[PDB]
Amino acid sequence: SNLTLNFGPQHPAAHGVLRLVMELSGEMVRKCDPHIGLLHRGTEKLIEYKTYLQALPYFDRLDYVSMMCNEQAYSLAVEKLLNIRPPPRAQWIRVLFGEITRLLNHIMAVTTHALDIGAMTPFFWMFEEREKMFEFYERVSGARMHAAYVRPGGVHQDLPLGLMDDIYEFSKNFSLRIDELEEMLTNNRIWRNRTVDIGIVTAEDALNYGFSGVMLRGSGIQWDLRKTQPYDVYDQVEFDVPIGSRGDCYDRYLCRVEEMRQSIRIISQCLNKMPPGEIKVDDAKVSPPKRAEMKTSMESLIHHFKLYTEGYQVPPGATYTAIEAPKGEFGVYLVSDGSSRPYRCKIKAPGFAHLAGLDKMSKGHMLADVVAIIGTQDIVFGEVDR
Amino acid sequence: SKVKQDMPPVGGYGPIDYKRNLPRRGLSGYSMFAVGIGALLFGYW
Amino acid sequence: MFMINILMLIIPILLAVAFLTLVERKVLGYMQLRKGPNVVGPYGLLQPIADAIKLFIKEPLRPATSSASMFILAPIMALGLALTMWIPLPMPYPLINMNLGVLFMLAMSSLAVYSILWSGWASNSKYALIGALRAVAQTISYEVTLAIILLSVLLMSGSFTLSTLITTQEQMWLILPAWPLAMMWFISTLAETNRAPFDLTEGESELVSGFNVEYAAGPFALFFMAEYANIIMMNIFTAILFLGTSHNPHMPELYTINFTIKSLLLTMSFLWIRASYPRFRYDQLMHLLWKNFLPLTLALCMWHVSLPILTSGIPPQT
Amino acid sequence: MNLMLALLTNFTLATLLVIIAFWLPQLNVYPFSMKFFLVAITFLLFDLEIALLLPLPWASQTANLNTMLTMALFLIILLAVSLAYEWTQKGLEWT
Amino acid sequence: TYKYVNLREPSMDMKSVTDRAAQTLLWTELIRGLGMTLSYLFREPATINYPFEKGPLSPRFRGEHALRRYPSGEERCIACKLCEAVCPAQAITIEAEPRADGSRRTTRYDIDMTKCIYCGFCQEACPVDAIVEGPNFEFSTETHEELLYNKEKLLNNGDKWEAEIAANIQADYLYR
Amino acid sequence: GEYVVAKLDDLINWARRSSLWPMTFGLACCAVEMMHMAAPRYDMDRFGVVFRASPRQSDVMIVAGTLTNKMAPALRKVYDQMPEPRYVVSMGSCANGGGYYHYSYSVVRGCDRIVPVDIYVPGCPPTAEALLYGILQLQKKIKREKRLRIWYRR
Ligand SMILES: CCCCCCCCCCCCCCCCCC(=O)OC[C@H](COP(=O)(O)OCCN)OC(=O)CCCCCCCCCCCCCCCCC
Ligand code: SF4
Numbered sequence A: 001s002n003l004t005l006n007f008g009p010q011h012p013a014a015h016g017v018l019r020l021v022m023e024l025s026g027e028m029v030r031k032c033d034p035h036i037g038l039l040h041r042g043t044e045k046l047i048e049y050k051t052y053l054q055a056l057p058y059f060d061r062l063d064y065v066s067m068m069c070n071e072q073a074y075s076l077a078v079e080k081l082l083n084i085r086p087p088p089r090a091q092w093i094r095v096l097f098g099e100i101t102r103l104l105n106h107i108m109a110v111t112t113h114a115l116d117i118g119a120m121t122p123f124f125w126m127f128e129e130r131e132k133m134f135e136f137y138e139r140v141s142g143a144r145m146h147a148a149y150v151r152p153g154g155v156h157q158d159l160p161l162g163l164m165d166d167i168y169e170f171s172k173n174f175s176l177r178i179d180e181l182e183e184m185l186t187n188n189r190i191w192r193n194r195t196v197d198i199g200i201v202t203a204e205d206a207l208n209y210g211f212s213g214v215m216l217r218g219s220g221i222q223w224d225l226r227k228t229q230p231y232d233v234y235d236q237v238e239f240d241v242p243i244g245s246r247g248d249c250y251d252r253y254l255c256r257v258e259e260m261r262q263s264i265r266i267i268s269q270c271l272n273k274m275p276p277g278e279i280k281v282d283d284a285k286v287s288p289p290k291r292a293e294m295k296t297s298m299e300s301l302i303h304h305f306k307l308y309t310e311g312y313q314v315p316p317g318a319t320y321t322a323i324e325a326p327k328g329e330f331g332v333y334l335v336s337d338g339s340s341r342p343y344r345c346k347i348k349a350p351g352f353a354h355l356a357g358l359d360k361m362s363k364g365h366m367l368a369d370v371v372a373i374i375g376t377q378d379i380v381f382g383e384v385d386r
Numbered sequence B: 001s002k003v004k005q006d007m008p009p010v011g012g013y014g015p016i017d018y019k020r021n022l023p024r025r026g027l028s029g030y031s032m033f034a035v036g037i038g039a040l041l042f043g044y045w
Numbered sequence C: 001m002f003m004i005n006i007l008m009l010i011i012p013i014l015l016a017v018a019f020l021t022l023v024e025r026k027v028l029g030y031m032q033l034r035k036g037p038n039v040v041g042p043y044g045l046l047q048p049i050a051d052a053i054k055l056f057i058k059e060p061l062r063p064a065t066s067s068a069s070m071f072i073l074a075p076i077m078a079l080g081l082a083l084t085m086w087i088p089l090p091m092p093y094p095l096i097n098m099n100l101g102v103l104f105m106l107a108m109s110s111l112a113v114y115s116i117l118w119s120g121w122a123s124n125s126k127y128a129l130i131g132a133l134r135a136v137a138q139t140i141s142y143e144v145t146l147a148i149i150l151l152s153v154l155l156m157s158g159s160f161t162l163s164t165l166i167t168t169q170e171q172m173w174l175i176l177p178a179w180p181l182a183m184m185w186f187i188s189t190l191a192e193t194n195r196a197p198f199d200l201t202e203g204e205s206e207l208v209s210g211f212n213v214e215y216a217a218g219p220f221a222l223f224f225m226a227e228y229a230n231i232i233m234m235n236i237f238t239a240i241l242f243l244g245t246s247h248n249p250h251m252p253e254l255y256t257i258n259f260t261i262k263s264l265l266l267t268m269s270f271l272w273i274r275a276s277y278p279r280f281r282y283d284q285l286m287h288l289l290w291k292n293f294l295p296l297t298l299a300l301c302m303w304h305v306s307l308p309i310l311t312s313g314i315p316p317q318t
Numbered sequence D: 001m002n003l004m005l006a007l008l009t010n011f012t013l014a015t016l017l018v019i020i021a022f023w024l025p026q027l028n029v030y031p032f033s034m035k036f037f038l039v040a041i042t043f044l045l046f047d048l049e050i051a052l053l054l055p056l057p058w059a060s061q062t063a064n065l066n067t068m069l070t071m072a073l074f075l076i077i078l079l080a081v082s083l084a085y086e087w088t089q090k091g092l093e094w095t
Numbered sequence E: 001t002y003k004y005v006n007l008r009e010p011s012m013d014m015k016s017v018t019d020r021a022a023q024t025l026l027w028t029e030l031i032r033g034l035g036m037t038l039s040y041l042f043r044e045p046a047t048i049n050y051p052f053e054k055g056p057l058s059p060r061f062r063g064e065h066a067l068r069r070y071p072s073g074e075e076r077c078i079a080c081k082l083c084e085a086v087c088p089a090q091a092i093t094i095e096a097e098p099r100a101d102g103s104r105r106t107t108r109y110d111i112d113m114t115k116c117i118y119c120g121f122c123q124e125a126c127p128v129d130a131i132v133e134g135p136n137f138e139f140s141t142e143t144h145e146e147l148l149y150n151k152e153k154l155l156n157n158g159d160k161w162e163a164e165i166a167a168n169i170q171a172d173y174l175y176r
Numbered sequence F: 001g002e003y004v005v006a007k008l009d010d011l012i013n014w015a016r017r018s019s020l021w022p023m024t025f026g027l028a029c030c031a032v033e034m035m036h037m038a039a040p041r042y043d044m045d046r047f048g049v050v051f052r053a054s055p056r057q058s059d060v061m062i063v064a065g066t067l068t069n070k071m072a073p074a075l076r077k078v079y080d081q082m083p084e085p086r087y088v089v090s091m092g093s094c095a096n097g098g099g100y101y102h103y104s105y106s107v108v109r110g111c112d113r114i115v116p117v118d119i120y121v122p123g124c125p126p127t128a129e130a131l132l133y134g135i136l137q138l139q140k141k142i143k144r145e146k147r148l149r150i151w152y153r154r
C-alpha cells in the first residue's frame, strides 16, 4: 500500500513541511521517497544579485535554528577570499555565540524530537532557556533570531556592558536543566524503546552517503571539524567530542545531550578568556569605520559611502569553506569574479545529504519509526531547500 | 578616559558545572522486593 | 423521585467532564512551567463554557458518510453507554443496586467498541476504517487483562456486587494484598481509554494524510464527552476496587467526600502520566499486553484462586 | 423497571443531544491484513475461557475444594499453554 | 579528545541483576520521571501577563521604522540613497529634488514593510541618523496596504516615537 | 428585538474569541517564533488558544513562513477544508508579501494571493510578543462582528 505523511504535526513545529511518499507492507516500511522543494526560495540565485554584505542575512534564514553559525561559515569564506583576518576579540565572540547557538539548536533538536514522539513536557522547560538565549542575541544585535551579527571582518558591534555577566548567570544553571531533561528521557524505557536500535547506520555507509556531524559520530567515527580543521579560536578551548557506539537514534540523542554539556564547558572558557580590543578588522576598505570617524574624517566618509553602496570588491577565486555547524558540516562553495557581488554561492546544507539517506535508514522499520528517524537527523527545510 | 568594554571580572568567573549529575536514589533490588513482598504478606494476613 | 435521581447523576457527570478539560489544561500547564487557561473567566473557570458554545455554533463538517444509520448510531452508542456505566456505582449507594453489578459493567464496557467500529465504517474513508480497526484491536486486547484482573480481585470479595467491595475493604485497602494487580489494572485502564502513552489514535492520525475527524464539531464534542466520562468512571471504579472507602450508614456524605477525593487524585494521575512520557509504538503496546501483562495476570489469577483456599480466607458468598 | 427507565433516559438523552447537534447547527447558514484478523480471533478465544472463569468466586464456597481448585488451575494453565503456543509459533509478532 | 556516551558493561553479579529486575518489574525509573514533573507542578511558572507585562528588550532592538529630525525640526534625511542602495530586500524607494529653499530633500520615501527583513542595514548606512528602526513592534494591521509606508507615515512615526528613539540612540551610539 | 440580537452577538463573539484553536502552517523561520509564543513565557494556551489543533477543528490559520509555488495549492486545500468561521493570520514578511524572497521565481508574493487574510503581523520574524499582539488584535476583530445584527435587518 502507498501512503503520504502529513506536512507537519498538529502542534507548532518549525522544521518546515515535507511530503513523504511511502510504500508499506503491513506495518513495515519498504520505500521512502521524500518530496522536498516546498521551501525552495531560490536563495542561491538571489545572492548573485547582492553585494557580499547584502547576501549575509540570507544565511540567517537557511538553518534558521543556527543563525550565527551560518553567519560564521559565510564570514569565514569571504575572509579567506579577501585574505584578511578578523581581530582576536571578534574571534572569541564568534566562538562564544557559536556555542550559544549550538545550545539553541540542540534544545530544538532534542526536545522537538521528543515532542513528535509524544514527550511534550521537556519542550516547554527547555524553550524557556531558549527564550533567555534569544535575549543575548537581541542584546548584541537587536534581533532575537536573524541577528546578522557575524560579518566578514569580525562582528558588527561590541558586546554591551553587563552582557557577559548575564551569560555567566545563565550558564551557571544550565547543566541542571540538562539533567532534568535526562531524568525524563535518558533512562526512560519508553524513550529507549523508541530510539534504541532505530535507524542504525554503519560507519562505512555514513561516510559514503555524505553524512556529517552527529550522524557520523553516532557510528563511532572520530571526526569533528572544530578539532581537525579548527577555525577562529577553537584551537584555544578544551572540550571532548562525544562518540557513539551503536550508530542508532539513542546514541545520537546521547551525543547531542553531551554536546550541549561541552558547549557550556566551552562557553565557560570564552567568558574567562575574552580579550580586549576592536571587534572588526581595522581595514576600512573591508569593514566600515566607526560612526564618529565617518562624521569627521574625509577618508572614513568615502569608505563608508562606498562600502554601503558598491561594497568591497573580493579578489577572484573560489573557496569551499566548512564549519562544524550544530547539524553537521555546513559549507559554502563561494565563487568571486573580482567584483563586489559573488558570482556563485552554492550552500552545502548538512541536512540535505542526511535526508537523502532517509530511505536507507528506514529500511526494515515501522511507520512510527520514520518519525523518530527524521527527528534524529534534525532536519530543517530552510537549509535543505535553500 | 580609560578603555571601558565588556570584560570578565578580575580573576575570572566562578566555576560552571557541566558534567551529567543524575544522583542515585532508592533502595537496592533486594530491599525493594522485600518491601513489596512484605506488603503482600501483611495484606494476605 | 427516581427520574430526579437519574438527572442528579447525568447532569453532574457532563459538568464534571466539561471542567475536567479545564483541569487537564491547567495541570499540564503547571507541570510545563506555564499556567494554562487563566483569562476566560477567573482562573479559567469560564473556559469550558466558551469552548462548548464555540464548538456547537461551528459550521458542521459535511458528512460524506457511506452509512447514515451507523453514522448517527455511533455517537449515541458512545454517550449512552458512557452514562450507563455510572448507574451501579456505589457512592456509597448505587442508583441501581445490582446483584451482578460487576458483570454489568464488564458487559456494558465490552459494547463500547461498537462506536469505534461503526464510526470508522461510516467514515467512507479507507484511512478511517484502518484507524478504527487499529483502535478496536488495542481496546479488545486490554479488555482481556482487565477482566482477568477484576476476577482475581473478586476472589477476595466473594461477590459480583459492587457494594460488597466496600465491605471487603472495611479494614484495609485491597491495594495492599493486590498491588501487583493494581499496577496492571491502572495501566490497562490507560490503554483501554486510549490515553497517553497509549494515545495511538491521536498519534497515528497525525502522521497519516487522510485520517481526519469526519464528524462535525457538535457531534465530535459528544464523542469527547463520552471519552472523558469514561475516564472519570474508570478512575471511580479503580478507587472502589483498590482504595475502598469506609462507609458510615448514618453519615453517607462522609464516604462521598473521601471517595470523591480519591477519584479526583486518580483522575489527575492520568494527567500526570500524560505529561511525563513519550508514546508507545503500536506493536510495542501490543507486546506489553500479550507478552508481559497477560503472562503475569494469568500467573496472578492462579495465585489468587489458590491463596484464599490455602490461607482459609475464603470470603462469604453473600 | 427502574433499570429500564434509567437505560431509556441515558440513550434518549444521547439521541436528543445527537439529533439537535446534527440538525440545529445546520440552521446557522454560511488491503485486508492477516495479523489484525488474528489478534481479533485470539481475543475471542481468550474471551471464551474468561467466561469459564467468571463463576470462580462462587465455586470457592463448595465443600469439594479439592476438585474445584484442580479444575480452576487446570483451566488457567490451558490458557497459559494457549498463549505459549501462539508465542512460540510467532502468532504475536508484527514484522 | 573524545568520550564514549554509551559504552558500559552491565554487571552480571546477582545483586546487580536483581537491581535491574526490580527496575523492570517495579517501574522505578518511570516513577523517577513522575517525580520530576511533580516538582515542576510546584514551581512558579515562567509566564508573564502580557499585555500588562512585557518581555525585556534592549536599546539596540530593531522595530518599526521612523524618519527623524534635527532639534530645529528640519528633516535629517538629505536623500543620499545609501539606505536604498544597501537595503538587502530592495524595500526602500526614494525620489528627490531641490526643495523650494534649495535644500536636498526627498519627495518620495517608501518602505514596503512586507519586503523589509528588519535587518537594520539602512540605519547603519545612514550618515545623519535619519532613518532608524524604532522600538515599536506592535503595529500589525488588518490589510496589506497599511504596511506600505510612504514618507508621511514614516515622518509621523518619527514625531510619534522620537522621545524613545532619541534616548535609545543616546544609550547605544558609543558602541557604533 | 434589537436588544436580544445585540446580546446574542456578544455571547457568540465572546465564545469564539475566547476559544481560538489555531492551525499553524509552520513553513519556515517564523514558525520558531510561533513556538516561543506557545512556550511558557507567553503561554498562548492561557488565552484559550490551544497548542495542538487539527485542521478540521481549527478556527484560525497562521501562515508562519515563506509560501512557495510548490506549496501554494496545498495551503489553499487546507484553508478550504477549514470549517467556518475561519480566519487567516499572515505572520512575517515572507507570508505578508514575499519579504526577502519577493523577487524569487519560486515564491508566492504574499499569501493573500492564495487566501483572504485577516491580520498581517510584520517582522522578519515578528517577535513572539508581536505575534501575540496580532492574535489579540484578531480577538478584538471578532468582538466587533455583528453577524446577528446584520441578519436581523435583512
Ligand atoms: C508470597 C508469594 C506471593 C506471590 C506473588 C508475588 C509477586 C511477585 C512479583 C511482583 C512484581 C510484579 C509486578 C507486576 C507489574 C507489571 C510488571 C511489568 O509488566 O513490567 C514490565 C513492562 C515491560 O517492561 P520491559 O522493560 O519492556 O520488559 C521487557 C519485556 N520484554 O513494564 C511496564 O509495564 C511499564 C508500563 C509503561 C506505562 C507506565 C506509565 C505509568 C507508570 C506510572 C504508574 C505507577 C503505578 C501506579 C499504580 C496505581 C494503582 C492504583
Ligand atoms: S531594515 Fe533592512 S530590509 Fe528593512 S528597510 Fe532597512 S535595510 Fe531594508
Ligand code: SF4
Pocket (backbone or CB within 6 Å): E076, E077, E078, E079, E080, E081, E082, E083, E084, E094, E122, E125, E126, E127, E128, E129, E130, E131
Ligand atoms: S534616510 Fe539616511 S541613508 Fe537614506 S537617503 Fe536619507 S540621509 Fe541617505
Ligand code: SF4
Pocket (backbone or CB within 6 Å): A061, A064, F028, F029, F030, F031, F064, F065, F066, F091, F092, F093, F094, F095, F099, F100, F123, F124, F125, F126
Ligand atoms: S519573514 Fe523572516 S523569519 Fe519569517 S519565514 Fe520569512 S525570512 Fe524567515
